[PDB]
Write a protein that binds this ligand. Sequence first.
Ligand SMILES: CCCCCCCCCCOc1cc(O)cc(COc2cc(Cl)c(S(N)(=O)=O)cc2C(=O)O)c1
Ligand SMILES: CCCCCCCCCCOc1cc(O)cc(COc2cc(Cl)c(S(N)(=O)=O)cc2C(=O)O)c1
Lengths: 352, 352
Amino acid sequence: LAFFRNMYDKYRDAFLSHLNEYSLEEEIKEHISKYYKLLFDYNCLGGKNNRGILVILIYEYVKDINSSEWEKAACLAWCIEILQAAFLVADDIMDKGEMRRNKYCWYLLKDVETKNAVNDVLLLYNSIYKLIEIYLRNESCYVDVIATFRDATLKTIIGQHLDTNIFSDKYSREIDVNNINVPEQPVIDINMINFGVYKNIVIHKTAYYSFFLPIVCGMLLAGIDNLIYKKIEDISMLMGEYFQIHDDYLDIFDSTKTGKVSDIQNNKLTWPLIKTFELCSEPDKIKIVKNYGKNNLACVKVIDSLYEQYKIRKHYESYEKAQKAKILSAINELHHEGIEYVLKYLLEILFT
Amino acid sequence: LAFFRNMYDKYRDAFLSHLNEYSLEEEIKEHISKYYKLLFDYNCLGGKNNRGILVILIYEYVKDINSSEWEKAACLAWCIEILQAAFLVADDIMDKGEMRRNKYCWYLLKDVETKNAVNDVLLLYNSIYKLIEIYLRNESCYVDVIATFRDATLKTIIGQHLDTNIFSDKYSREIDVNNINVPEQPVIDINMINFGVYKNIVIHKTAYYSFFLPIVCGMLLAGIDNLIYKKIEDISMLMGEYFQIHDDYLDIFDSTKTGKVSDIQNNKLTWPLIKTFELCSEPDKIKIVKNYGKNNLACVKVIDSLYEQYKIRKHYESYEKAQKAKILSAINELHHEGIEYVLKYLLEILFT
Ligand SMILES: CCCCCCCCCCOc1cc(O)cc(COc2cc(Cl)c(S(N)(=O)=O)cc2C(=O)O)c1
Ligand SMILES: CCCCCCCCCCOc1cc(O)cc(COc2cc(Cl)c(S(N)(=O)=O)cc2C(=O)O)c1
């Protein structure tokens, strides 16, 4: 079952040995494999592996499975860990990040820098489909597996776009393709602070690839199309909202435990923000507008101090409990003991 | 035939309405479509469309074509034009470009910056595979087409990696995962200034997606695996070299015609550099090492002086004629009239 962590070496080396079939001077090949080995190890290891665990479990509890068929599923499982590694490198470039899984972000290393990092997220991304071909080309589900990766990816790209631009000038007129020189001054848009817009962003940014895709993958590989998928997809949207709100909470509340340091500085629409904005006073809205989305520690400190004043922790647990219950309620209306066993177990182990 | 200029709006709108049926608010939906309309139009238009045209021609000259079949072939043609959109957004980030196709580089605009640009190369790259599916799900060549796009993209990712790092320290060691502070100053490595290495870089960075892929897509659609594909691969390699070397020679010899600003400044391994290193005395080798790769006006003027002095235009004319001959010679060993003509057309229209 969770031996999964051991087959990592063979899926990474399967792809490295494909690179090594290229017509290149033997000296270049040694430099190529040395660089890309560190690219895969540095950025795929060190996670909780929840999304990969999720595939292996759904595969087993939809359900007698020989060792040849566990190889195909462990490949899907690592393909989703690779997929998150490629999201991490991109996010850390995009969000001017500093620390990830308690190491320097990949793009900050002066031996790689941005130029290499941008090129590396596309290598990692494409390595997924190569692994999928190498291990599943002859399955009946091959075309649908790669269509689920492609479509889940598209959705989280759109979700990443919204997360980055929800507050920007071009969403409050016309993109000026002649301005390379007046850098927009980031500012909140009070008209966008609400949960309708939050769920739109976070469903797309989190729920499809962290939950819909690993489940649907585990089920396409087992043999299932059926009207159960749409019920799985609704639970997914609930677990994605529930996971992202927890992630927003962690951003402001310990880097040693989370492994990261940024949402106020980066002018993001977050749960702590929409919470504060509905309960605070009219003076307090003016301070939020004035200080949100700057790099001043003084401006961040103002926003953090407001989050304590209004005790947003207490509100979080209120949300967490009510939502945990809404997910369990949604799992039980699914009518499938095996998959219901995986989702409940996952719901317990999501943050550990 | 070359009417495929007219079909752009429908393949672009095809992808845009895939996004437009996402579960998002109505106001959010229209912001997305306004931004991604400009994304496609800014970066797929304004080029010469040599790769797109090559697909349409090869398809027609391997053969009797109905309207439905043209709608598929012109999809593959814009897919490769979108592919080259993604390759620019990315090449211009990594090389800090200023002008691409007589406009500002996409990442340089203040409404997009680097954070949106990185996210946009993944959207453009992935939109290709949505388009191929919409129009080719039910064709027998469908899987062969998606795999050709994938293995081509992988090779140019590797070539672009070598092009970026052949002169850096890690290619002369190991990567310091502790260094985020001491930046690497760009320098020349004389062990890498040879045509063996350059052919490795250029073939991967250019030959596969610029030639092999658009030709293979044409043939696959036409129904042909066969040993002719191996012959197309070596032609492709001779034409990739030919085309990059011409590009190199234009970098020193006007943004009116080329549409872009920089190889000396940017420490690039180019054919002028390699040739000049063969012909020159070793006191001039020392000048090169001292002046190449410096963001300094005196320094590129010294390297320019050296290209003029060792008569680089005269040697480019020689190379160009001998290489053109060897490509025509390979073309004739094809033993297929329709492709031979297209490759003769292409070899004449390459710079126009
Ligand atoms: C294949 C990439 C194609 C281009 C994609 C560009 C957009 C990528 C967007 C990824 O978006 C994210 C948004 C977020 O709010 C957070 C994250 C990161 O979430 C994490 C979640 C988990 Cl469970 C874990 S883990 N592996 O330590 O257990 C890690 C991350 C993480 O950032 O490391 C990514
Ligand atoms: C799907 C992208 C995944 C990440 C890829 C990162 C690396 C992208 C590398 C693209 O590599 C190139 C290498 C080169 O030496 C040159 C180029 C561009 O060359 C051009 C040649 C021509 Cl004829 C033309 S055009 N369409 O304007 O008539 C354009 C390009 C081009 O710059 O667009 C791209």
